Design a protein around this ligand. Structure first.
Ligand code: VLB
Ligand code: VLB
Ligand code: ATP
Ligand code: ATP
Ligand code: MG
Ligand code: MG
Length: 1156
């Protein structure tokens, strides 16, 4: 995959013209430097002695080359970006077409989300990897070679030494980049412990809040943050040392080159202009190669990904849903013959589900299926639709094999109502019309009437226009089934397969659905897989599938007389803003560091005007007319000075780095600490919201250093360095004349913006496109995750056309952005050449009257222009400021958060002793996530000291909500709750959490030692190993722990992978019992555990029941039998209360549950 461009045979003209334009543009700059050297030489010759004519001629040369540069740059960038846009459009369209056309098995194998992220990331990477980067690389190569050519043709010795020095700097920069990358990877690795701890704690937020173990997790995260801080400080020091060494090497090379050139010219060789042009061209060539480092790498970054994408296009599917070569029968009579159907799913090919079966079905035969859970009746259903292919068998209709007919046409005549129908997020009318494009409003009404969906469909607003919510959120359990049935019927299917037709909420609509389905069956063959036998009785025939083969056959009476498995089954069943002054939170911790950093930044910035002054003096050495030998010595004084400056730079930068990094890491630590603390000292409701997801929160806490540290330190560093450099240059220039200084000030801004934009053109080329790509994202994703239904009804054509339109809508935007980027880049490039021309023409005109010496004019020009270029480059170098500012605003918002239930708060009551007598009255509460769904209906409970209460009812009554409110996770909307006649709100939060104990319905265990895991139940006190052993004996886990290796030292794995689920539940129960809470709550303690284990847990609870109020929420009525009191929930309202014997005497809802 070295040449992965294949589209728009006429687009290659764009690529070729762009390549030529890039070559000529890169070659131009060395020509500009050559004419600059010639102009300097002629100016020096004039100074030694009509200069106006020569100055005008060279100004015209500058103007012509600048116009050529503008045209070439526009052609290059515009054409290359045009080609990139066209290629990316074609690639995305083809890739989506291939994905939709792919076979079902291939999708079932690979993760669908993986495929979606592959699509988006790979296409974005390819977009970044061609067009702009290719043009930049060709420009860099052309500049390299042309500069070397200019140096050689106008130099024989100085060019050689410059070229030989160049690889030293190149290798130094390469090794610096390599070490920086490796150490950045190491630093990333250094956050593994912190990331894991944060993820585990956030996932266990509920349990940790219940146990009040914030301090230990915070300390662990603090240790991890300290390690990461050391790593980051080392990283920053290394990077700053590398940059300083690069600058030192550059200045050493410049000093050596200028010294050698001065010696050579003093020997009588080529004059100063030749030295200047040769040196500048050599440096341009030697440093242009570095500009190519991203492009090629980006190409590689865009290379491998492309490979993978192409593979997906390459694979021709076994079942081409888009192919039309398949035969198309004219009249399709209802008749099915599946003989020796043997097959298995390639996802797990080891297990063979289909082992050959015989099934002959006539027209309009409601052949029901009977078997066991997982017997493979849904495999027979799937194989019926021709999605897969039998390993060895024959499925035919009307004597013709399934493969003998076109897949699309064959699937069109066959409708399937899956167990979990999915409706696309379109209009209900569009949902119905998905069956066939040629569907009229009258047909839609007829289908609605047949499905008996007229009431539900028309009652809501927009009867034929309502947009179905994501995954039918607005729809109902039976509404989706009715809509699917109507859509299936809209296609006039010949074979209708059904699976779990109305197994969603009840059978009220099931009767209507069955009546509608059975209304028309003469021509439309039917197959049904219904768990309920109600419709089985009316079934024309019933086939019993077992061991991958049909066993039972015949009518219901025949099956009953045959003593089949079906007979036994029937018998049994019957945008906050930001602020800088406010964001100055590092001053307290960096009062003496920021000052040194600013001082070093000022010195580094002033280094540039020092270079300008030194270079101007060096040129003036020969610009002078005295021409003594002393100049040689003077030249040395200048030449050596160069080296000195470099050394100073190498110091300051290093001294800067250790400062800046030290300023950063500290904050990076503190924030990472503080934010995490602020995360724990918050209410659960804050964690209960779409915004706060564990992944989002942990990423925000993880990728925050680079933003806050950037915006704080780097902003000040770059601002100080830039003000130093540019202001010093401006003042020094104004000292040496002002008119030329005024013109150069006028032309500085274009230079600065050009530098900034060109620097940004490498990395941040593609950052705003996604905001439009999402317009198709959903459309693609909706067709990937929910692809089974789409392939079922053959609706890929509409999805691909919609994808085409959604790509077209931003395609014009992409074209326009390409054009504007090209135009602005070309104008930016031409700006420098125009500035050179105008400024030097003005300087020549001024010096003609002896107003200012040529040396002064050159000094001002160099100072101001080089300062503009330096500010552009350095401003581009620093991290982006907007993203950093918004991230810092988010961090400030998080850290400043004030909760409704603050654990850290010391305001509250801390009673010495309590009887644990709970009294809740008129308890009203709603979940802040969905306040429009109240769960509490004014409960009334009064549990006395040493009293056991149990909660029963139907799922969804909020049983777990009672426990949640007991721990004071959520404040009550209304009602009074008192533990021994004391207001809950007035009571302390930490004391309440410690004194009480709970057992999670879904217990989780951290990746800690068994002893440590058990001890984590309690906090703020050292638990002796003897206490842990006694508690384990309480839960009957001491012997189990001893049996396993390491005893309690056995490091429990993540979620206790090694340990059994029942073992994890027992460990959680033991941890809860360690604190010996007065009030203990177990929500489905049994749940999934050994019956003997549940009995042992109940016995252990009873042993400590005395003086320990207990609450139990479990489905095992046997445990509730001995419960002191039982309360049955009725939609959040308690119906009956009292002892179990009283409940038995007072028959009611519980009576049915006990019998059930
Ligand atoms: C004329 C073109 C060029 O000279 C090319 C680079 C950038 N500038 C000139 C000055 C310069 C360079 N580096 C600077 C750092 C701070 C301030 C200025 C510079 C330049 C260099 O060292 O002079 C020879 C350079 C730059 C980079 C550079 C190497 C380099 O020296 C050749 N790296 C290749 C990239 C880089 O992003 C990368 O991915 O390395 C693979 C790299 O990151 C790493 C991993 O170190 C790095 C640090 C050197 C990171 C942040 C900024 N990016 C920009 C590109 C990259 C650099 C050379 C213009
Ligand atoms: C249209 C915007 C712009 O292209 C921006 C820069 C300036 N001009 C274009 C011409 C240009 C650039 N460089 C030239 C060298 C010789 C002749 C012409 C140029 C430009 C570039 O490299 O594009 C390929 C550039 C120039 C520099 C430049 C960056 C730059 O863009 C890559 N640097 C800011 C300085 C520089 O001296 C410096 O950073 O250290 C002091 C820098 O040295 C380094 C470290 O690369 C360098 C270029 C190698 C060296 C010697 C002379 N100084 C003066 C300014 C500085 C340059 C690009 C206009
Ligand atoms: N598309 C599929 N990909 C992979 N495995 C599948 C697929 N469909 C079914 N299976 C698995 O193959 C076996 C066959 O069971 P299948 O799902 O076909 O039964 P069923 O008739 O739907 O019964 P039930 O719904 O009562 O479990 C099961 O283990 C099932 O999980
Ligand atoms: N964090 C939450 N976000 C959204 N809804 C929630 C949240 N916590 C609870 N709910 C809602 O509260 C109810 C959950 O009931 P709860 O589990 O408290 O009682 P239950 O009778 O023990 O439950 P189940 O019958 O499901 O075992 C559901 O309505 C659920 O939507
Ligand atoms: Mg099934
Ligand atoms: Mg529950």
């Amino acid at each position: 995959f070295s040449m992965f461009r294949y589209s728009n045979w006429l687009d290659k003209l764009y690529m070729v013209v762009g390549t030529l334009a890039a070559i000529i543009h890169g070659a131009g700059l060395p020509l500009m430097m050559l004419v600059f050297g010639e102009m300097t030489d002629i100016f020096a010759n004039a100074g030694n002695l009509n200069l106006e004519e020569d100055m005008t001629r060279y100004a015209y040369y500058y103007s012509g080359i600048g116009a050529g540069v503008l045209v070439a740059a526009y052609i290059q960038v515009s054409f290359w970006c045009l080609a990139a846009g066209r290629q990316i459009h074609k690639i995305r369209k083809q890739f989506f077409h291939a994905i939709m056309r792919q076979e079902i098995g291939w999708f079932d194998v690979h993760d669908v989300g993986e495929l979606n992220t592959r699509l988006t990331d790979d296409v974005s990477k390819i977009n970044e990897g061609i067009g702009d980067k290719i043009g930049m690389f060709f420009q860099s190569m052309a500049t390299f070679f042309t500069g070397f050519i200019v140096g050689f043709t106008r130099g024989w010795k100085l060019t050689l030494v410059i070229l030989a020095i160049s690889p030293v700097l190149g290798l130094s920069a390469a090794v610096w980049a390599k070490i920086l990358s490796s150490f950045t990877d190491k630093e990333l690795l250094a956050y593994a412990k912190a990331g894991a701890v944060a993820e585990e704690v956030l996932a266990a937020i509920r349990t940790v809040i219940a146990f009040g173990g914030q301090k230990k997790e915070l300390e662990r995260y603090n240790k991890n943050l300290e390690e990461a801080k050391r790593i980051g400080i080392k990283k920053a020091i290394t990077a700053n040392i590398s940059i300083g060494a690069a600058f030192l090497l550059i200045y050493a090379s410049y000093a050596l080159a200028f010294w050698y050139g001065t010696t050579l010219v003093l020997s009588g060789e080529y004059s100063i202009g030749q030295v200047l042009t040769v040196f500048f061209s050599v440096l341009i060539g030697a440093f242009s190669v570095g500009q190519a480092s991203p492009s090629i790498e980006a190409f590689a970054n865009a290379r491998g990904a492309a490979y993978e994408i192409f593979k997906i296009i390459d694979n021709k599917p076994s079942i081409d849903s888009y192919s039309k070569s398949g035969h198309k029968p004219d009249n399709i009579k209802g008749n099915l013959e599946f003989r020796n159907v043997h097959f298995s799913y390639p996802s797990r090919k080891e297990v063979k589900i289909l082992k050959g079966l015989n099934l002959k079905v006539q027209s309009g035969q409601t052949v029901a299926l009977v078997g066991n859970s997982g017997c493979g009746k849904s495999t027979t259903v799937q194989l019926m639709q021709r999605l897969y292919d039998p390993t060895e068998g024959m499925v035919s209709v009307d004597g013709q094999d399934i493969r003998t007919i076109n897949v699309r046409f064959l699937r069109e005549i066959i409708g399937v109502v899956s167990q979990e129908p999915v409706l696309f997020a379109t209009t209900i009318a569009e949902n119905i019309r998905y069956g066939r494009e040629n569907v009229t409003m009258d047909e839609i009404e007829k289908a609605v009437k047949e499905a008996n969906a007229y009431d539900f469909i028309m009652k809501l607003p927009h009867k034929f226009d309502t947009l179905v919510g994501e995954r039918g959120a607005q729809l109902s359990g039976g509404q989706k089934q009715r809509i699917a049935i109507a859509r299936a019927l809209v296609r006039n299917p010949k074979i209708l397969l059904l699976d779990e037709a109305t197994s969603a909420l009840d059978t009220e609509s099931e009767a209507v659905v069955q009546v509608a389905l059975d209304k028309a069956r003469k021509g439309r063959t039917t197959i049904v897989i219904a768990h309920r036998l109600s419709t089985v009785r009316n079934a024309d025939v019933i086939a019993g599938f077992d061991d991958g083969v049909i066993v039972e056959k015949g009518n219901h009476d025949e099956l009953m007389k045959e003593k089949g498995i079906y007979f036994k089954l029937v018998t049994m069943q019957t945008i906050p803003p930001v602020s800088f002054w406010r964001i100055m939170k590092l001053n307290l911790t960096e009062w003496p560091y920021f000052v040194v950093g600013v001082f070093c930044a000022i010195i580094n910035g002033g280094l540039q005007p020092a270079f300008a002054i030194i270079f101007s003096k060096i040129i003036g050495v020969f610009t002078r007319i005295d021409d003594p030998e002393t100049k040689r010595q003077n030249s040395n004084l200048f030449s050596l000075l160069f080296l000195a400056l470099g050394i100073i730079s190498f110091i300051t930068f290093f001294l800067q780095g250790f400062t800046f990094g030290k300023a950063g890491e500290i904050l990076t630590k503190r924030l990472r600490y503080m934010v995490f603390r602020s995360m724990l000292r918050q209410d659960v409701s804050w964690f209960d919201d779409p915004k706060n997801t564990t992944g989002a929160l942990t990423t925000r806490l993880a990728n925050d250093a680079a933003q806050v540290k950037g915006a704080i330190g780097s902003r000040l560093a770059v601002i100080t360095q830039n003000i130093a450099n540019l202001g010093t240059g401006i003042i020094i220039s104004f000292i040496y004349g002002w008119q030329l200084t005024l013109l150069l000030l006028a032309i500085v801004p274009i230079i600065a913006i050009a530098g900034v934009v060109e620097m940004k053109m490498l990395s941040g080329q593609a950052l705003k496109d996604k905001k439009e790509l999402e317009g198709s994202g959903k459309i693609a994703t909706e067709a990937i995750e929910n692809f089974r239904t789409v392939v079922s009804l053959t609706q890929e054509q509409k999805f691909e056309h919609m994808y085409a339109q959604s790509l077209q809508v931003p395609y014009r935007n992409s074209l326009r952005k390409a054009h504007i980027f090209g135009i602005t880049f070309s104008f930016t490039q031409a700006m420098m050449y125009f500035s050179y021309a105008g400024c030097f023409r003005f300087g020549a005109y001024l010096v003609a009257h002896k107003l200012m010496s040529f040396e002064d004019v050159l000094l001002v020009f160099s100072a101001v222009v080089f300062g503009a270029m330096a500010v552009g480059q350095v401003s581009s170098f620093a991290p982006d400021y907007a993203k950093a500012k918004i991230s810092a605003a988010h961090i400030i918002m998080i850290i400043e958060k004030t909760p409704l239930i603050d654990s850290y708060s010391t305001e509250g009551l801390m009673p010495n002793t309590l009887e644990g007598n709970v009294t809740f009255g008129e308890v009203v509460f709603n979940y802040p996530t969905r306040p429009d769904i109240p769960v509490l209906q004014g409960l009334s409970l009064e549990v006395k000291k040493g009293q056991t209460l149990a909660l029963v009812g139907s799922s969804g009554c909020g049983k777990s909500t009672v426990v949640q409110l007991l721990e004071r996770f959520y404040d009550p909307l209304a009602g009074k709750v008192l533990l021994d006649g004391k207001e809950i709100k007035r009571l302390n939060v930490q004391w309440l959490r410690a004194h009480l104990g709970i057992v999670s319905q879904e217990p989780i265990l951290f990746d800690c030692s068994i002893a440590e895991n058990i001890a984590y139940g309690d906090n703020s006190r050292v638990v002796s190993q003897e206490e842990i052993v006694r508690a384990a004996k309480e839960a009957n886990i001491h012997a189990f722990i001893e049996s396993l290796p390491n005893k309690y030292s056995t490091k429990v794995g993540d979620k206790g992978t090694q340990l059994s689920g029942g073992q994890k539940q027992r460990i959680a129960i033991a941890r809860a019992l360690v604190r010996q809470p007065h009030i203990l709550l177990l929500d489905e303690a049994t749940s999934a555990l050994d019956t003997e284990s549940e009995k042992v847990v109940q016995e252990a609870l009873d042993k400590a029941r005395e003086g320990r109020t207990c609450i139990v929420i479990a489905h095992r009525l046997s445990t509730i039998q001995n419960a002191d009191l039982i309360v049955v929930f009725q939609n959040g309202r308690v119906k009956e209360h009292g002892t179990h014997q009283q409940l038995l005497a007072q028959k009611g809802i519980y009576f049915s549950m006990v019998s059930v």
